[PDB]
Amino acid sequence: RKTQPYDVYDQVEFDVPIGSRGDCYDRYLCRVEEMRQSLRIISQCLNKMPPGEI
Amino acid sequence: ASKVKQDMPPPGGYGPIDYKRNLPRRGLSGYSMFAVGIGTLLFGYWSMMKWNRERRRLQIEDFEARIALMP
């Protein structure tokens, strides 16, 4: 979504969670933080919905 | 003849949406909990010391009752 964006992903701001140990705990933390960043993106999408055809 | 009506965000915008972590501290110091534990132990020790001394006295009394009845 950051390096090769599609749709309007280049118009929203979010963070990419990065791990350090490569274990199950780091991936769990990454997925939780990804949920939080998804909430952030959802807020931006709600506030930036344009009019027009679908 | 009417305006274009569509599902849109309200004029202005939406209220802020919280996303950051919230895990408040909500805890006592370590010294506090350790002190509470030690004080509870000391109170229990004092109570048990008194009670066990009384129990020893009672045991001696009933042993002497047995001694009196033995012959």
Distance CA B31, CA B28 (A): 8
* CB B10, CB A49: distance < 8 Å: no
Which residues have C-beta within 8 Å of that of residue B8, sequence separation ≥ 6? A49, A51
Is residue A41 within 8 A of residue B21, CB to CB? The reply is no
Q: Taken in order B62, B63, B68, B71, is the CA torsion positive or negative? A: positive
Backbone phi and psi for residue B16, each to the nearest 5 degrees, phi listed first: -60, 145
Sign of the dihedral defined by the CA atoms of residues B11, B7, B20, A5, in that order: negative
CB atoms B17 and A43 under 8 Å: yes
Q: Tell if the CB–CB gap between B19 and A47 is shorter than 8 Å.
A: no
Compute the distance between CA of residue A15 and CA of residue B1 in angstroms, rounded to an integer: 46
Distance from CA of A43 to the nearest CA of B (A): 7
Residue of A nearest to B20 (CA): A36
User: DSSP string of B45-68?
Assistant: HHHHHHHHHHHHHHHHHHHHHHHH
Q: B19–A51: do the CB atoms touch at under 8 Å? A: no
Name the structure determination technique.
Answer: cryo-EM
